[PDB]
């Protein structure tokens, strides 16, 4: 079957300021088929009760989803998004970089 692997971007809703509440986003897009597993990580551990958008798709039929959770960034804490999809042999981890 024809399959497309997800693009992944990890970023904040607002410009990051240490000690100030914000939202951490993981946007997955460009994938097919639609089943996909997405976790947000704080210092390597899964964040509980992450929310996500309703399944929709782009003009080229590929799917996209936004996963998000409230967070308060700090200098020390590391955040990331972990994605699995049928196209991936193992989960792909993308780190949150506040400059990206």
């Amino acid at each position: 079957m024809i399959q497309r692997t997800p693009k992944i971007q990890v970023y904040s809703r607002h410009p990051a300021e240490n000690g100030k509440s914000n939202f951490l986003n993981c946007y997955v897009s460009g994938f097919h088929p639609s089943d996909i597993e997405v976790d947000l990580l704080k210092n390597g551990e899964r964040i509980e009760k992450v929310e996500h958008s309703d399944l929709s798709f782009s003009k080229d039929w590929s799917f996209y989803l936004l996963y998000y959770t409230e967070f308060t960034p700090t200098e020390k804490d590391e955040y990331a998004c972990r994605v699995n999809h049928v196209t991936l042999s193992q989960p792909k981890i993308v780190k949150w970089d506040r400059d990206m």
């Binding site: 079957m1 024809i2 399959q3 497309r4 693009k7 971007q9 970023y11 809703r13 607002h14 410009p15 939202f23 986003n25 946007y27 897009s29 460009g30 097919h32 088929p33 639609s34 958008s53 309703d54 399944l55 929709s56 798709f57 003009k59 039929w61 590929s62 799917f63 936004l66 998000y68 400059d99 990206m100």
Partner: protein, 276 residues
């Protein structure tokens, strides 16, 4: 400005894990306003934007009946397409449909759309005439013949020129404070050395709506398409979108580079430079 309405249907089979899931979402431009999911505990059409909440019970029930009936018909369609492609009962497959209407700045119908895909590939599309079909292969030709026999195009046309436009105009009025408001990008340029002789310039656009935007880098007034890294426009989660474009430049040549930004929210395109 110009505006559109679209509904996006996804029907996904899952042998051994129950009947195929059907999910429909509706959008005006880049704003989702409804959803229906056959996997919900109690499937019903649900509002997803504040301006649709004013619609009465008859509206919600009308939507729900449409989506419940479509859920059942798409299960039949998935069975039919499996057969048209001589496929096994073992695999999971997906039918997608996107359809809706486009209006120009005067509120008049520009054109309608009604396109379907199977396993992520074009399957059948209503032509711009809203009267004939384009089928991608001999399987889709079976659907085309069936839809020609049942005069389906006439149904799609009646909707696209009628209720589609009428309800889009209603939504645009009811949600005018947001749907008819373009928020311009907030912009800045960052600078990060990558080595002693090169640095990255990154041009940022944040907080804009709708998502359509053009962000480019020029060197000495020349477009740098091949050497620009452009990320996909991405949702912030507060209705707005974000984008950046980056180029790696020789240290000392930074002022030869300009970032150009166009967006509906902007009267005239912006030109930005790194400001040390």
């Amino acid at each position: 400005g110009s505006h559109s309405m679209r509904y996006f249907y996804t029907a996904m089979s899952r042998p051994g894990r129950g009947e195929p899931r059907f999910i429909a979402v509706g959008y005006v431009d880049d704003t989702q306003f409804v959803r229906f999911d056959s996997d919900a505990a109690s499937p019903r059409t649900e509002p997803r934007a504040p301006w649709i909440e004013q619609e009465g019970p008859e509206y919600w029930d009308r939507n729900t009946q449409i989506f419940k009936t479509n859920t059942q018909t798409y299960r039949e369609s998935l069975r039919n397409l499996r057969g048209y492609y001589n496929q096994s009962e073992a695999g999971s497959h997906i039918i997608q449909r996107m359809y809706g209407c486009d209006l120009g700045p005067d509120g008049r119908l520009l054109r309608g759309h009604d396109q379907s895909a199977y396993d992520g590939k074009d399957y059948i599309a209503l032509n711009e005439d809203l009267s004939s079909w384009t089928a991608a292969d001999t399987a889709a030709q079976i659907t085309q013949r069936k839809w020609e026999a049942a005069r389906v195009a006439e149904q799609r046309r009646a909707y696209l020129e009628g209720l589609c436009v009428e309800w889009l105009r209603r939504y645009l009025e009811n949600g005018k404070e947001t749907l008819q408001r373009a928020d311009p990008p907030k912009t800045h340029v960052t600078h990060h050395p990558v080595s002693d002789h090169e640095a990255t310039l990154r041009c940022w656009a944040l907080g804009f709506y709708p998502a359509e935007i053009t962000l480019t880098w020029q060197r000495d007034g020349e477009d740098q398409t091949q050497d620009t890294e452009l990320v996909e426009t991405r949702p912030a989660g507060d209705r707005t979108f974000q984008k950046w474009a980056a180029v790696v430049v020789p240290s000392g040549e930074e002022q030869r580079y300009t970032c150009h930004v166009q967006h509906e929210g902007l009267p005239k395109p912006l030109t930005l430079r790194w400001e040390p």
